[PDB]
C-alpha cells in the first residue's frame, strides 16, 4: 500500500491476445486525461478541456503496443498458457444531477469489476435500443488490475420513458439489464 | 466463451506534499497478476511472483535499463507534474447542493471537483449526526464527483432543515434550506 497525495498513470498499456487489441491512456487522479486511438494513430481527448495541459505523440503508444505484443507472448509461455479468468461485472445506474421532469439530464451506467476488458454497453428506452445521446469512457484502471467503464445517456426525463442499461460479458450467462425509471 | 490472455503495463507516479517526495512505480501484469515491479524506493527490479524472477534478473544487469528506470522519476514523473498535473490540481468545480424528500431527507451534493468535501445536516441550527447516512464519494467518470447524504427526520411544523457544504472551490460554505411544508 503506497500513501500519496496524488497518483498519475503515465501510461496504462493494455494489450490482449483476443483480437488482438490494445488501449493506451493516461489518468490523473482516477480520471482519463486522454487516450491514443490505435487504429487512427491519433491522440484523442474524451474531455477536450484537457488538451490545455499536455499533448502526446501517438507514436509513443504504438511503440509500447509493439513491446506488449512481444512480451505477452513471452509471458503466456512462462505461465503455461493460463487463460484469463472471466469476472462478473457490477453494473449500477444513477443520474448525474437530481431528477426533475422536463430538465435535461445525463444517465450514468457504471460497469465495475470488468475482466477481461471486453464489454458491450448499450442503453434501452422503453425496451428499444437508443443510439442518440450515448457516449463512453475508456477502460479505466483499478489497483486489482481489473477495469471499470462508464457509459452516458443524455435524456429528457418524461412522464413515461423507462430506461435500462444492457451489459454483455463473458462472465455473464445472459445479457444483464439494470433498470432506471424517473 | 473465447479464451483470452491479458497484458497490462502501468507506469504510475505517486506525488506527496507538492513535488517534494516523488515515487515512481512500474507494474508488468499477466492477467490479474503483477509479476515484475520497478519501485523507485527499492531501486531495482523486483519479482513479485515466481514467473518474474528471471525477467528482473536480466534487466537488472543491463546498465542501461536499470539506469533508465532510475531516471524515470525525474525525467517522466517530475516533468508531467510541470506539463499537466499542476494545472489539473488547480481545477475547481463548484458543487450543486439540492435537498429533496424521498420520513427521509436527501442532500444531494453534485458535480464537484476536486474530491474533498464536507457535508453537514442541521435541524434548527443544531447539527444532526445520529440520523445521517452518507454514500462514499461517487465518481461520475467525467471530471466530477457527487455524494448523497441522508438525514432521518420526523418533520414538525416550524422546523427548518439545513444542508451545509464546504469544498475547496467555495470561499464560504453553501447552505440550502428545506422547510417542513
Amino acid at each position, epitope marked *: 500500500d503506497i500513501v500519496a497525495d496524488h497518483v498519475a498513470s503515465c501510461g496504462v498499456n493494455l494489450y490482449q491476445f483476443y483480437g488482438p487489441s490494445g488501449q493506451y491512456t493516461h489518468e490523473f487522479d482516477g480520471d482519463e486525461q486522454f487516450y491514443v486511438d490505435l487504429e487512427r494513430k491519433e491522440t484523442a481527448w474524451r474531455w477536450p478541456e484537457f488538451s490545455k495541459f499536455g499533448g502526446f505523440d501517438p*507514436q509513443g503508444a504504438l511503440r509500447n503496443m*509493439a*513491446v506488449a*505484443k*512481444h512480451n505477452l507472448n513471452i509471458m503466456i509461455k512462462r505461465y503455461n498458457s493460463t487463460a484469463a479468468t472471466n469476472e462478473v461485472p457490477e453494473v449500477t445506474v444513477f443520474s448525474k444531477s437530481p431528477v426533475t421532469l422536463g430538465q435535461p439530464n445525463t444517465l450514468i451506467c457504471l460497469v465495475d469489476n470488468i475482466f477481461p476488458p471486453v464489454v458491450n454497453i448499450t442503453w434501452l428506452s422503453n425496451g428499444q435500443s437508443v443510439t442518440e445521446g450515448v457516449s463512453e469512457t475508456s477502460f479505466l484502471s483499478k489497483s486489482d488490475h481489473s477495469f471499470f467503464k462508464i457509459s452516458y445517456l443524455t435524456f429528457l426525463p418524461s412522464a413515461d420513458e423507462i430506461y435500462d442499461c444492457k451489459v454483455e460479458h463473458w462472465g455473464l450467462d445472459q445479457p444483464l439489464l439494470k433498470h432506471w425509471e424517473p | 466463451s473465447p479464451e483470452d490472455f491479458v497484458y497490462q503495463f502501468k507506469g504510475l507516479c505517486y506525488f506527496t506534499n507538492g513535488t517534494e517526495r516523488v515515487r515512481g512505480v512500474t507494474r508488468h501484469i499477466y492477467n490479474r497478476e503483477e509479476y515484475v515491479r520497478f519501485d523507485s524506493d527499492v531501486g531495482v527490479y523486483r519479482a513479485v511472483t515466481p514467473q518474474g524472477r528471471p525477467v528482473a534478473e536480466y534487466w537488472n544487469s543491463q546498465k542501461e535499463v536499470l539506469e533508465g528506470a532510475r531516471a524515470s522519476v525525474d525525467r517522466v514523473c517530475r516533468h508531467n507534474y510541470e506539463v499537466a498535473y499542476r494545472g489539473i490540481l488547480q481545477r475547481r468545480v463548484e458543487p450543486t447542493v439540492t435537498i429533496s424528500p424521498s420520513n427521509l431527507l436527501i442532500c444531494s451534493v453534485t458535480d464537484f471537483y476536486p474530491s474533498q468535501i464536507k457535508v453537514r445536516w442541521f435541524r434548527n441550527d443544531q447539527e444532526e449526526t445520529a440520523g445521517v447516512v452518507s454514500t462514499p464519494l461517487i465518481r461520475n467518470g467525467d471530471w466530477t464527483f457527487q455524494i448523497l447524504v441522508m438525514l432521518e427526520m420526523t418533520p414538525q411544523r416550524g422546523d427548518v432543515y439545513t444542508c451545509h457544504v464546504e469544498h475547496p472551490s467555495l470561499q464560504s460554505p453553501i447552505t440550502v434550506e428545506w422547510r417542513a411544508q
Partner: T-cell receptor, first 111, second 114 residues
Framework: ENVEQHPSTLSVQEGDSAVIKCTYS??????FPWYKQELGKRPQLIID?????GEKKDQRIAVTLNKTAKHFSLHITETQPEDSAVYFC???????????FGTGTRLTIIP | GGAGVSQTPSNKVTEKGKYVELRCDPI?????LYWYRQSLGQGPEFLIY????????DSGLPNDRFFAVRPEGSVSTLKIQRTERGDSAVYLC??????????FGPGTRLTVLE
C-alpha cells in the same frame, strides 16, 4: 518531419577545421546523433547530443545545440584525410524514436 | 548476433518482377531493429521499426510490396515482392539496446535492372 543540412559539399585543407550546420523543425526533438559514412559502408555513429546540454566535446570532434533556435552543428578540428566521408545529422524525439536525417555533407580533406 | 550489425551480401543484383530478401543479423541483445533506405546522393530514410518481435512503426514502407519480419525478435528479413527499377537503393539496418541510440550495418545495395 524534417531536418535541413548545410553545406552540401565541403573542402578543407588538412589541418583547418570543418563545420556542418543543421536545423530541425519538430521542437519535441530530444536526441541528435551525427554519422560518418565511408563509401560502400554504413553510417558510423561518431557523436550525439541531447537537449539538456549545449555543447559536447570528443577529441578532434565537437557538437553544439541551440534548442530555442533549433540549430545544431558539428565541428571537426585539426582535420586529417581519414576524415573524408559523407556526414549526416539526424534528430529523434522521446516518443518517436526513428531518426529523420539531413541531406548529407560530402567532406573532402585535401592532403 | 555479433559485436556489430551485419548484413550480407553487400550487393544483390536482380531483374524486374523477381522476389528479393534482405537479411540482417542484429547486435546480439539489441531489442530494437530499424530498416532504412538510402537512395544514394541523399540521406537515410525510415521504413520500419521493430520492438522485439513486433512492429512499432511501419509508416515508412513505400508500398504494399514491402514487408519486414523478425520472428524471434532477433534476425530480421525485409521482403520485397515484385521488384521494379525504382527500388534500387542501399538498404541499411540499424539496431539499439532500447530504441534511442542506433548503430547501423554495412547495408545491402540492391541493384534492380531491366
Amino acid at each position: 518531419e524534417n531536418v535541413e543540412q548545410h553545406p552540401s559539399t565541403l573542402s578543407v585543407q588538412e589541418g583547418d577545421s570543418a563545420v556542418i550546420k543543421c536545423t530541425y523543425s519538430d521542437s519535441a526533438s530530444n536526441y541528435f546523433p551525427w554519422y560518418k559514412q565511408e563509401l560502400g559502408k554504413r553510417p558510423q555513429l561518431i557523436i550525439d547530443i541531447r537537449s539538456n546540454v549545449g555543447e559536447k566535446k570528443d577529441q578532434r570532434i565537437a557538437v553544439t545545440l541551440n534548442k530555442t533556435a533549433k540549430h545544431f552543428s558539428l565541428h571537426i578540428t585539426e582535420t586529417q584525410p581519414e576524415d573524408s566521408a559523407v556526414y549526416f545529422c539526424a534528430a529523434s524525439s522521446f516518443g518517436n524514436e526513428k531518426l529523420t536525417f539531413g541531406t548529407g555533407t560530402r567532406l573532402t580533406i585535401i592532403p | 548476433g555479433g559485436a556489430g550489425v551485419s548484413q550480407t551480401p553487400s550487393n544483390k543484383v536482380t531483374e524486374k518482377g523477381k522476389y528479393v530478401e534482405l537479411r540482417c543479423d542484429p547486435i546480439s541483445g539489441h531489442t530494437a531493429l530499424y530498416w532504412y533506405r538510402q537512395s544514394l546522393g541523399q540521406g537515410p530514410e525510415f521504413l520500419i521499426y521493430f520492438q522485439g518481435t513486433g512492429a512499432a512503426d511501419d509508416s515508412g514502407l513505400p508500398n504494399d510490396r514491402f514487408f519486414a519480419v523478425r520472428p524471434e525478435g532477433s534476425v530480421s528479413t525485409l521482403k520485397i515482392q515484385r521488384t521494379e527499377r525504382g527500388d534500387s537503393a542501399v538498404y541499411l539496418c540499424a539496431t539499439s539496446a532500447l530504441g534511442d541510440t542506433q548503430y547501423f550495418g554495412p547495408g545491402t545495395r540492391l541493384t534492380v535492372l531491366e
